[PDB]
Design a protein around this ligand. Structure first.
Ligand SMILES: [Ca+2]
Lengths: 29, 222
């Protein structure tokens, strides 16, 4: 949703910035 | 970069990769000692990699330089990604040559309809375009009406939209901090969007032309 375009690894949504979610591939988007 | 093409090697010689274990954001060289990027790309120490075309291969053109200072805009707001611009001072000056050249700061704001180039090593959403080789995309600046209509009430004076409302061509994760260059001047820094290359969701960019006073005073403050 508002999601900065930085490449960031994640497991769960809370690892991401703003309204980005952790997408299946292990990265925020 | 989604919907773009592989850049001619070193055609964007101001482009840098910010690396802390892997590429995570881009940036632009604006003189021998300083790089402009996005404030949400902040890390206290980053390695800046210049003269890159394929980031996973040593080509002989590269300069890897550690930051000595990383300075976010004082008014950056993480909640809504406002005033998303940052300066990075290199611990030693870059050697300027055929592969590494600075980009000029803007003399004025570019009007809607100006055609610009954005570049980066981010997600291409394609099995054909390799994100390890620098990608290039030509995008027009959109009017504030179009920009605010796509993201109602979310667009501040420090932001502009650029791209295609039909979708298909856009910047994407891994491109943050990189350049939007229009007629030889850095007009934007890749910042945020909803998804990538979605219809009605163009990319939003930090508007460099309103930060010239902070950028040029900070590049000589210390
Ligand atoms: Ca390389």
């Amino acid at each position: 949703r508002v999601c900065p375009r930085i490449l960031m690894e994640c497991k769960k949504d809370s690892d991401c910035l703003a309204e980005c979610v952790c997408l299946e591939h292990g990265y925020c988007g | 970069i989604v919907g773009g093409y592989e850049c001619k090697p070193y055609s964007q010689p101001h482009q840098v990769s910010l690396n802390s274990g892997y590429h995570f954001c881009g940036g632009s060289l604006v003189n021998e000692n300083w790089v402009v990027s996005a404030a949400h790309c902040y890390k206290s120490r980053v390695e800046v990699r210049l003269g890159e075309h394929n980031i996973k291969v040593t080509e002989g053109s590269e300069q890897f330089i550690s930051s000595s200072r990383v300075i976010r805009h004082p008014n950056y707001s993480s909640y809504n990604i406002d005033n998303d611009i940052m300066l990075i001072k290199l611990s030693k000056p870059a050697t300027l040559n055929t592969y590494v050249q600075p980009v000029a700061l803007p003399t004025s704001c570019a009007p809607a309809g100006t055609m610009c180039t954005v570049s980066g090593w981010g997600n291409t959403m394609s099995s054909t375009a390799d994100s390890n080789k620098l990608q290039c995309l030509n995008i027009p600046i959109l009017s504030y009406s179009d920009c605010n209509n796509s993201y109602p009430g979310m667009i501040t004076n420090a932001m502009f939209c650029a791209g295609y409302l039909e979708g298909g061509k856009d910047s994407c994760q891994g491109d943050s901090g990189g350049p939007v260059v229009c007629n030889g001047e850095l007009q934007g820094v890749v910042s945020w969007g909803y998804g990538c290359a979605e219809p009605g969701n163009p990319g939003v960019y930090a508007k460099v032309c309103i930060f010239n006073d902070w950028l040029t005073s900070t590049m000589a403050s210390y």
